[PDB]
């Protein structure tokens, strides 16, 4: 499955600098495959089998592939991922004007590593809400061009730099985007208004608020002497989003399938959607108890320069295939029946499979196995995974999507 | 008018991932412009009006533009830059095999900022020395392709990462280039040999040693909402090398002109070369006292997230022109005469000029008077530094006015 | 307006020293306004145009305005606030007898500031559960009188008192209520029986258990040279409770409206009440997705003596109007659409509006905007707010309640 798959990933990451864009990319692909969009606000006709997707807040998406069999007999085959990643968001009154520069004050979304955000050609994307012709409207904008940089302080002026210092997100992370007069006027909402005309043709009476993420304009790429790796932003968790979608779109059979890609993992929807798919009563409970959730989120590869952060018996290899993640304290829902099932699936697909627990010194109600492709450096602005692993994961999710029996 | 310089700089940086490659790029352009190479091993016949360059270790270059009058009478105009930048160099027995990976051990060259080298698509380039059927060869290689990465450790396994930790070069900086295990012979010198075949159609008997730097494969680029900035590796100090060379090739007037770009600044050539110009005896000392060296190396612009690392009266602006660097404890050789001269020179060429002095709580065995100047930058010694998209034009104009200058102090 | 609104607030705080008392004060206001209590054990018949309220544990209240067009088309407009505040609670067996004094052991409720509770004329109020003719009753009591003091230790005996010491809640916070003889014997439940007789004309067989809060007997008050401020206990969050009830009672139009004042916010109901207001499980998601929750809870005004605790670009000003609270990491669920709407709603209702974000180094599935009035000294026994802001908040909350169209 190539190469083609790895190229599909790179394009998908490119089109998705935010959870909003991620969602839009998933939906345009779902639509090209003939899934019809449902609006939660409207009444649903619903025809049995039955290809649908629904969004919430333009940043969460559920894909529903209804099969021949009653979900009360066959249960659901659910794959879960998330559409968000740690990053830096623009503040509501962002303009900072000092030493000739115009900067934008940012907050740190999620458990982001600060250091890798320095010295990158960053751009800006996300959702803008504005008033046009009286009505409230929302669009996505993506500046595409590299408009921003968080420069490092020179080592000459910070000689114990490599000894480590607590990077202060308030002081040290606002990006520079331009130079000002001064005195010159600076209106970031005016800049967004320009970007609305430019990107959308819309003229806008005033710009109200926004959810804008800086991101790396350097694309994901295949790296390594023998091309054994993929480097890029947002692998956690768009690698899983892409994988599950590719598995859903190419799945054999007529099983009841769901793809759930939710927002804010990194900080109800599925339940309300499912309760609408089912004639209420014991139907919900009977379908869900026959179901299985494969929760796909990146795993930690044992890192060669940091090998002792891992249990020696449980250090996943990049390109060694999907990792089954166990944690007895319910950090992962995986148990012997869901783990045993997934393990059996990989064997029948001839896909290699690994295990991970952490070092011991470190709500729908569905059965769940937690898996993930091994990865280095989450959540940096540029994470690392293996170039063989996407084909592995797509193979077994596709096998799972086509599985008649579940535990 | 300004954008071709910047385009040329981006091209120059791309072709120069190492000091060896920068010297090669500089030399290629000089030859295209009519400068001819002198070998230091050989006798020189230098006629006036002549255009020469000189090379040492394939990583230092001196470019000579001999003028109408003897340098004994009218002096030298000298611009200095350097061809090296902090980076990671491959060790001589580099193969590290563990957890299924192949890695290359690296030493840190210069005062590199470690953290920015993480999570970068790295490639490998430099000089390779080998024995071929059966003589001693040196060639330059550039894998071009992204072959290596130094991944960060996940924050889940280093939760107090943003509080800082002392990054250990021996431990945390060896890059991953491939996967091994279940076997398997890993021999780096053999990989170099395939790279010799692939790049030069050359095969080798045995590869002996090599000087190879890892570099960022992401090109330099113009950035900012109004394109005010240039980002890239090696702005320290290929920015000045470019600037100096553009200015040398296009400067008007006669006048004796010198471009000196030396290696190992980040850690005798010039003096020996200048002496082989001019007659024996007192000719040298007399020429040098009528001479002036503009040492061009990047300055620090005042950083708006770190503004108090600067003196509030001496905070250079990106795109505010060349900076005169003063340190009366001779960290810079600038004195009031050479600073005065350069200031006069900028004012005549309509080029804006700034001053820098360090916060007070923080050549030349030739004996040439010197002014130290630089274009203001951020993130000096990072894998990716920042500079003004306007400053290069500013610098080339004033160096051009310097090379054309009739009089010196 | 304003002076009358502020007097109403003051009276409300006085009437409400506990969650139980806040709920009772809300309940008797609504009933005066014609709202009829719905018992959760009963079956409900709700007509259009209905005005209802329902309580739980006598300390949470949900008031409901049913309009004419169905929640399936128009959704609900919901205002959220909470009934509780940080304070000190009497323990089950509280009598401490030492040094001639009677004291009551107290546990610290919520994230209270300890120092301000010292040297205050405290009283005691809350719920008493007792047995009367073997029947088992609960009544509210309010001693009203200043019956307790937690005195500071004199600076002469604690000379570095101004250097700060860790205040130990178990040791330094039990208040003094009386003096005791040599061996005089004290029974707190006996004093509670006398208060039952005193306040309700009731004798108890035996007093069983209780939930009693100490509170300051100093009334809320307008303060400042130009009367720009209001000072009082429990401004977090009875300020919002009061503002929401005014807004609900005076709201024009006939749209579907909810006021949610819950208990225990400072350490299920809403969903269960909403589900009983509309048929299927398809109707729930449809109506909730068309709804909007303005979650109203005090924000932090930038304090002139601690101004560096705020972001310089996001320092809300007392009497500056409601504050839209923002946090990408969902400490506040505000997004660009619900912020846009609220900002619009303020600007075309002529109320000034402010944004808040923290310094970067510091459910039922409904869209939400977190907003609050700017406040000083939050979780102290005596908090500070603007004497102009309550009028602002009531104005825009009413504007909200009369909004036909929601994001
Ligand atoms: Co994840
Ligand atoms: Co993550
Ligand atoms: Co330098
Ligand atoms: Co340097
Ligand atoms: Co509160
Ligand atoms: Co509170």
UniProtKB/Swiss-Prot annotation, chains A, C:
GO molecular function terms listed in the Swiss-Prot or TrEMBL record: aminopeptidase activity; metallopeptidase activity; zinc ion binding
InterPro entries the UniProt entry points to: M18_aminopeptidase_2, Peptidase_M18, Peptidase_M18_dom2
SUPFAM superfamilies to which the protein is assigned, alphabetical: Aminopeptidase/glucanase lid domain, Zn-dependent exopeptidases
Transmembrane segment boundaries: none
Names of required cofactors: Zn(2+)
One of the record's GO cellular component terms: cytoplasm
Alphabetic keyword roster: Aminopeptidase, Hydrolase, Metal-binding, Metalloprotease, Protease, Zinc
Gene3D superfamilies reported in the protein's UniProt record: Aminopeptidase i, Domain 2, Zn peptidases
Any matching Pfam family: Peptidase_M18
Enzyme type, top EC level: hydrolase
Residues annotated as binding Zn(2+): 82, 156, 379
EC identifiers of the protein: 3.4.11.-
GO biological process: proteolysis
Family: Belongs to the peptidase M18 family.
Protein name: Probable M18 family aminopeptidase 2
Lineage: Bacteria, Pseudomonadati, Pseudomonadota, Gammaproteobacteria, Pseudomonadales
Designated gene of the protein: apeB
